[PDB]
Design a protein around this ligand. Structure first.
Ligand code: CLA
Ligand code: CLA
Ligand code: CLA
Ligand code: CLA
Ligand SMILES: CC(=O)O[C@H]1CC(C)(C)C(=C=C/C(C)=C/C=C/C(C)=C/C=C/C=C(C)/C=C/C=C(\C)C(=O)C[C@@]23O[C@]2(C)C[C@@H](O)CC3(C)C)[C@](C)(O)C1
Ligand SMILES: CC(=O)O[C@H]1CC(C)(C)C(=C=C/C(C)=C/C=C/C(C)=C/C=C/C=C(C)/C=C/C=C(\C)C(=O)C[C@@]23O[C@]2(C)C[C@@H](O)CC3(C)C)[C@](C)(O)C1
Ligand SMILES: CC(=O)O[C@H]1CC(C)(C)C(=C=C/C(C)=C/C=C/C(C)=C/C=C/C=C(C)/C=C/C=C(\C)C(=O)C[C@@]23O[C@]2(C)C[C@@H](O)CC3(C)C)[C@](C)(O)C1
Ligand SMILES: CC(=O)O[C@H]1CC(C)(C)C(=C=C/C(C)=C/C=C/C(C)=C/C=C/C=C(C)/C=C/C=C(\C)C(=O)C[C@@]23O[C@]2(C)C[C@@H](O)CC3(C)C)[C@](C)(O)C1
Ligand code: KC2
Ligand code: KC2
Ligand SMILES: CC1=C(C#C/C(C)=C/C=C/C(C)=C/C=C/C=C(C)/C=C/C=C(C)/C=C/[C@@]23O[C@]2(C)C[C@@H](O)CC3(C)C)C(C)(C)C[C@H](O)C1
Ligand SMILES: CC1=C(C#C/C(C)=C/C=C/C(C)=C/C=C/C=C(C)/C=C/C=C(C)/C=C/[C@@]23O[C@]2(C)C[C@@H](O)CC3(C)C)C(C)(C)C[C@H](O)C1
Lengths: 176, 166, 178, 70, 193, 193
């Protein structure tokens, strides 16, 4: 029985070696998608959403680079596209993806002796790849995914400052 | 062991029957009674939302079946004689037709099931598995119906219509 | 034992790049698996050398030019094609490249010649075998730098319209301001 | 999705397709249990079922919109 | 802890468990521990709230200003009740934030009151041991450490007095609020409430 | 390198390592070497910068011309902070060029502060051993060899003094910058700042 859903049996592929494992796979994607591919995708989305959340919050608070538009994060995409300097953020993304994801993706698909998904060996400071720091990475990334989804769909809906709620801190704190 | 299946198996988060297993039969009787009245009330709400009887509710009064709303206001706009007739009908049906307790409180029939109040003339499933499944769906529908009926009652108390704002 | 690239340590080594200078394992797209290393390295050295000469010549012509050639770097190609001094380069470099294709054909067939070795070493730099490997690595490093250098030279020159530095007008002032 | 009628129609079409579909002679309408379908076919049972449910839902929604019923 | 494994029986009810509904008798010991913890929390909040209205009705305020744009006297010009609204939004946000931190810490202490722990004994040093967090070791309860001079037999008596005063306080705070709302509900209350 | 082995503990925090957060205990060994080298670099940069800012605020400036048409008084007339914008771009270009050279040369030395080198020990004579490069053997640290007349225990005492002065220096330089940006945030900064 899975630890997360106590009325279903966990898949055999999940086991307990992977970081962030909680037996949560009710519809068993792990049989139709390789777990390493799924983990690489999970970590990629998690990292992109962490960066997106912190960048959105910074730009909304007002942290702006010189010569850039002085706009909120909701209109920042359109403003940057109009002003021009937004393809040079795609260019490093282009080289990183084409020269690290495609080879790593084909290694995960084909090679048996390949690094696990989301492992680029990126440890400049040597902080450590412990299983505590992988669990923390995964938990923060999942929280950032949900938080970014909420932030975008609330900012577009309400068109308000940082809280992205209609009333403000009053909705997070009804006592106010 | 009837009642207990589903997403959550036994579910006694305060341990009532665990502390007092002798009272499980009484609690089952009360649950079945509440579920039955709840299913009746929910069906009444759904069917009164769409269909209203044609005719005078009382010749002495000026009130038709169509003027009543579907809620506390609808129940309020009934003559006291009609309300008394409803009350005594429920009283007879619950005291002489379907008495859950043979005698006093906490004295449900040991030979019969806790909610076995129907007489000889009733639908009976002579199969243990089918009987168990049908009783399980009975009690589960009772639970869902009474939660939903509390929802309807609170919505109609607050706004006036059982359906809440969309 | 599994070999990982020294440049992409999350990928397995190609295993086709063994026994070559500048072998940090940079080949994510696996061109060595398909094409032969001799052909690929001959192309690399040709690009390196032509790019070194090009990046030096672009900057040099931005400053000095012969009396007959009064053209800027950008219009020099068109002006000299019209004059006929690019045909005189394509004829005397095409002769060199005819000999070069004979050479690369021979080394791909297994004559013994290396990928980019022509034997051209008049002044004797690196005639000692100990210094030849280091000088080959330095050649590759400088050439691979010069490729990007020439690319930046041409692109920034056309983009800015400025002669030597290839910098916008605002970049010559207040570029270290808080 | 915008309209509650549209959501109701799409949900009903998806449930009807999932109930009445049959893969290799196995289906809920043909008295195959949910657990056996889940083990035999996996999430391919939901993916194909909901894909055709969306196709038939689109067909009926567009037809009702054309007819003015919606 | 259990039906009789918890103090709080007094001579007012003849040293008997005053449970007309029989809730304590019916629910399990885990629910009894939950109920005791909630009882003590309500009693403590009420002992704070009752003396915090009494001061509001008396009209005593700290000299000075609560913020640059509003004064301690300005915030309580509307009698006790209409004071929380008058307080600065950032101020009440900070108060609720620290209360949230205390509540979450007390819940995250491992020997939970339900699952094998003392009911009513929230940990006296919250925020200690949280990774990636530092706070001064200011003991939440008795920072001056008045407990070192008391024996266990005295602590039992003081816990009994705590429960009795707490119960009286939750009666009293509701009485004061009901007197403020309904004028003639509770006698012996002046117009300040 | 490893936290217990570093001369970082002082008498300010009870002769104990001061890591309120769980950083040093969460990071591996070489991350601490990186952090210590970074601490020393920040401390020394701010230790020079605070003195430079004080001199600029005081207005003590060299007698002469920084360029053929610009005076040190002219670039300092706009206060200590705007002097960086006032100085010629072609001069701060040379300053950043030599800083680039020093940083790259310090990073290129083999043992490496993360790979078995002393963190915070910038190698003396950074421009030696470099092919295709000559520079006179003027030591980056102590060019007059003041350290020669010091003992190892005295040098350890002075390393501790260096750290405790540098930390205060970065506090001071951020104080100056925040005092300029947000007015009145840091008192003791008159209009000259
Ligand atoms: C990629 C290599 C390359 C190419 C394709 C060209 C192409 C051109 N150069 Mg040349 N040039 C090059 C390298 C190159 N250059 C280098 C390395 C230098 C520095 C010495 C110069 C210096 C130079 C000058 C000063 C001038 C040109 C000019 C020209 C144009 C006419 C040809 C001529 O007279 O060249 C002359 C080339 C040389 C004297 C260099 C010969 C030595 C070669 C590189 C071999 C060295 C190894 C043996 C033509 C567009 C003329 C022009 O139109 O200017 C506007 C011109 O005035 N170039
Ligand atoms: C019960 C719901 C419902 C309703 C009310 C409608 C209504 C309609 N559908 Mg249909 N449709 C439905 C379900 C429904 N559909 C479903 C479940 C599907 C499967 C996805 C489709 C797929 C479908 C298609 C693909 C098309 C329609 C079309 C139509 C329209 C013309 C039908 C006709 O007489 O063809 C005309 C009669 C003939 C005999 C034509 C014969 C043609 C062959 C090639 C000869 C009409 C508005 C047609 C249209 O033009 O819609 C606007 C159309 O092209 N429907
Ligand atoms: C952009 C915002 C942001 C950032 C940069 C981080 C960063 C971090 N979070 Mg996360 N976190 C965030 C938002 C963010 N969080 C939000 C909004 C929540 C919801 C309340 C959480 C809830 C959360 C929890 C519950 C935990 C983390 C943890 C962590 C740390 C994981 C790695 C680690 O142990 O480092 C090494 C540790 C340190 C450098 C010490 C902590 C440094 C500061 C105080 C943070 C890391 C510092 C984990 C952790 O270990 O935190 C200490 C952890 O347990 N975060
Ligand atoms: C950026 C500068 C900087 C850096 C890199 C470090 C680094 C270090 N300090 Mg710290 N330190 C600093 C500034 C810095 N310090 C300042 C300004 C002071 C004076 C208050 C101190 C006072 C101090 C003491 C008293 C001790 C240390 C120690 C240490 C070491 C162990 C703790 C640790 O893991 O830190 C890791 C550090 C970081 C990862 C930096 C994180 C910075 C965060 C993200 C932002 C902080 C914002 C700040 C509050 C804004 C104020 C304005 C480590 C080498 C201990 C030591 O050496 O023990 C052997 C020790 O005893 N430091
Ligand atoms: C007597 C004889 O001889 O034979 C009989 C014997 C026997 C056995 C009795 C038979 C039977 C079967 C019978 C009579 C069964 C009757 C069952 C019955 C009458 C069951 C009601 C359920 C109601 C529920 C669950 C309500 C949920 C309500 C919910 C979920 C809600 O909250 C409502 C709501 O959320 C909505 C939906 C919309 C939202 O906007 C919000 C609101 C809150 C408004 C036979 C075999 O047929 C014949
Ligand atoms: C053996 C032993 O020792 O113990 C055993 C035996 C013993 C003691 C007999 C037992 C018992 C019986 C107990 C304790 C039973 C408890 C029953 C309970 C607690 C029943 C609540 C109903 C609430 C309703 C219907 C609310 C409607 C609410 C409605 C319709 C509203 O809308 C109210 C409204 O305010 C709103 C929400 C909003 C306002 O805008 C509008 C208004 C004002 C209208 C136990 C548990 O078995 C234990
Ligand atoms: C009457 C009379 O006299 O008329 C004369 C006078 C007059 C008018 C002056 C004339 C003229 C003009 C002439 C002759 C002009 C000549 C121009 C020429 C020959 C211009 C070379 C540039 C070279 C560059 C930019 C190289 C950079 C190279 C670099 C960046 C390096 O140092 C690379 C480096 O790797 C080293 C090498 C060593 C390493 O440790 C360090 C690094 C890695 C950095 C004439 C035509 O002669 C006529
Ligand atoms: C009360 C209040 O609020 O105040 C406000 C206002 C106030 C006070 C202004 C503020 C501030 C700023 C602060 C705190 C500034 C601090 C600045 C600081 C700490 C500046 C160190 C410089 C060290 C140097 C240059 C060392 C050179 C060292 C050299 C050249 C040597 O090597 C000397 C030596 O080699 C010899 C020659 C011989 C050897 O035998 C011995 C040694 C090796 C030793 C605040 C923060 O805003 C607070
Ligand atoms: C619960 C079920 C139920 C049963 C089993 C039942 C049986 C009988 C029998 C047979 C034994 C007779 C003979 C009879 C006769 C009358 N019933 Mg009655 N009745 C029931 C329910 C209601 C309700 C809800 C109302 C009502 C009424 C009347 C009126 C008045 C008419 C008028 O007002 O002109 C008359 C004459 C209305 C009322 O009291 O009106 C003041 C009214 O609202 N009844 N009713
Ligand atoms: C028990 C709860 C509690 C705690 C633990 C706590 C801790 C700290 C600490 C930590 C060491 C700091 C550094 C700090 C600082 C400030 N607090 Mg604060 N504070 C608490 C409660 C209140 C209330 C009720 C108010 C308040 C305020 C301010 C203002 C005024 C800013 C201004 O004038 O704009 C400043 C600067 C007032 C306010 O928000 O005024 C708009 C206000 O009404 N605080 N407060
Ligand atoms: C039809 C109609 C009308 C009507 C009506 C009528 C008669 C309505 C009757 C409604 C009725 C009879 C509604 C019962 C609800 C009971 C509920 C929700 C019980 C929840 C109980 C719960 C959730 C208990 C849970 C637990 O115990 C569990 C399981 C285990 C323990 O460990 C833990 C706890 C204690 C948490 C009007 C108004 C007259 C007029 C209108 O016009 C039309
Ligand atoms: C090294 C290498 C390769 C290469 C290469 C490359 C790109 C080499 C390039 C060489 C280059 C660019 C060589 C220019 C010479 C210019 C001369 C001699 C100019 C004469 C000019 C004369 C005689 C006169 C000019 C006039 O103006 C005068 C003075 C008077 C005016 O009235 C008019 C005229 C026009 C008459 C390979 C082969 C591609 C691959 C191999 O792997 C590596």
């Amino acid at each position: 029985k899975s630890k997360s859903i106590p009325f279903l049996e966990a898949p055999p592929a999940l086991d307990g070696t992977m970081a962030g494992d909680k037996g949560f796979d009710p519809m068993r994607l792990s049989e139709v998608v390789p777990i390493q591919w799924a983990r690489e995708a999970e970590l990629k989305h998690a990292r992109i959403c962490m960066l997106a959340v912190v960048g959105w919050v910074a730009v909304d608070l007002g942290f702006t680079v010189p010569y850039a538009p002085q706009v909120s994060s909701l209109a920042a995409h359109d403003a940057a596209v109009e002003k021009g300097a937004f393809l040079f953020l795609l260019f490093p993304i282009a080289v990183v993806e084409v020269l690290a994801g495609i080879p790593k993706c084909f290694q995960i698909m084909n090679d048996p002796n390949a690094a696990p998904g989301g492992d680029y060996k990126f440890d400049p400071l040597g902080i450590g790849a412990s299983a505590d720091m992988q669990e923390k990475e995964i938990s923060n990334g999942r929280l950032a995914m949900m938080a970014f989804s909420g932030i975008v769909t609330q900012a577009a809906l309400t068109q308000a400052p940082f809280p992205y709620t209609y009333n403000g801190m009053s909705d997070l704190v009804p006592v106010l | 062991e009837l009642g207990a299946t589903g997403p959550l198996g036994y579910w006694d988060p305060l341990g009532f029957s665990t502390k007092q297993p002798e009272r499980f039969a009484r609690y089952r009787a009360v649950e079945l009674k509440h579920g039955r009245i709840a299913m009746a009330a929910c069906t009444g709400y759904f069917v009164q939302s769409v269909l209203r009887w044609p005719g005078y509710l009382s010749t002495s009064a000026g009130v038709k079946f169509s003027d009543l709303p579907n809620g506390i206001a609808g129940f309020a706009k009934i003559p006291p004689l009609g309300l008394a007739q409803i009350f005594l009908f429920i009283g007879l049906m619950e005291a002489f037709t379907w008495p859950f307790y043979q005698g006093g409180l906490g004295k449900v029939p040991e030979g019969k099931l806790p909610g076995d109040v129907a007489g000889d003339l009733w639908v009976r499933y002579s199969d243990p598995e089918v009987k168990k499944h049908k009783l399980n769906v009975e009690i589960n529908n009772g639970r869902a119906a009474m939660m939903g009926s509390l929802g309807m009652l609170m919505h109609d108390h607050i706004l006036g219509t059982w359906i809440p704002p969309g | 034992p599994v070999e990982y690239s020294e440049s992409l340590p999350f990928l397995v080594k190609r295993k086709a790049l063994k026994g070559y200078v500048g072998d940090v394992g940079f080949d994510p797209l696996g061109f060595s698996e398909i094409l032969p290393m001799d052909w690929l390295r001959e192309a690399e050295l040709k690009h390196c050398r032509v790019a070194m000469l090009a990046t030096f010549g672009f900057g040099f012509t931005d400053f000095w030019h012969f009396p007959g050639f009064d053209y800027t770097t950008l219009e020099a190609h068109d002006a000299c094609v019209a004059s006929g001094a690019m045909s005189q380069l394509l004829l005397w470099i095409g002769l060199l490249e005819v000999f070069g294709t004979i050479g690369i054909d021979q080394t791909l067939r297994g004559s013994g010649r290396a990928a980019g070795d022509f034997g051209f070493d008049p002044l004797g730099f690196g005639s000692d075998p100990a210094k030849m490997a280091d000088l080959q690595m330095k050649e590759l490093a400088n050439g691979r730098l010069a490729m990007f250098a020439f690319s930046g030279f041409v692109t920034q020159s056309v983009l800015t319209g400025n002669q030597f530095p290839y910098l916008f007008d605002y970049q010559t002032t207040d570029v270290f301001a808080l | 999705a915008y309209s509650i009628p549209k959501a109701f129609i799409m949900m009903f079409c998806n449930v009807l397709v999932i109930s009445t579909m049959t893969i290799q002679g196995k289906g809920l309408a043909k008295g195959t249990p949910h657990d056996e379908m889940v083990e035999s076919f996996g999430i391919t049972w939901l993916l194909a079922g909901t894909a055709l449910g969306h196709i038939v839902g689109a067909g009926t929604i567009l037809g009702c919109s054309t007819a003015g019923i919606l | 802890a259990f039906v009789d494994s918890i103090e709080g029986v007094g001579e007012e009810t003849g040293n008997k468990i005053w449970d007309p509904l029989g809730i304590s008798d019916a629910v399990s010991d885990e629910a009894v521990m939950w109920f005791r913890h909630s009882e003590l929390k309500h009693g403590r909040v009420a002992m704070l709230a009752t003396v915090g209205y009494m001061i509001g009705a008396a009209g005593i305020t700290f000299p000075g200003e609560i913020a640059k744009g509003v004064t301690f006297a300005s915030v309580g010009a509307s009698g006790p009740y209409a004071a929380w609204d008058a307080t600065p939004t950032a101020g009440k946000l900070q108060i609720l934030t620290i209360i949230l931190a205390l509540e979450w810490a007390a819940e995250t202490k491992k020997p939970h009151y339900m699952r094998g722990g003392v009911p009513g004994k929230i940990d006296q040093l919250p925020f200690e041991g949280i990774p990636g967090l530092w706070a001064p070791k200011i003991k939440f309860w008795d920072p001056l450490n008045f407990m070192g001079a008391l024996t266990e037999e005295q602590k039992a008596r003081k816990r009994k007095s705590e429960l009795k005063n707490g119960r009286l306080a939750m009666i009293g705070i509701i009485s004061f609020l009901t007197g403020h709302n309904i004028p003639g509900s509770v006698p012996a209350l002046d117009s300040h409430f």
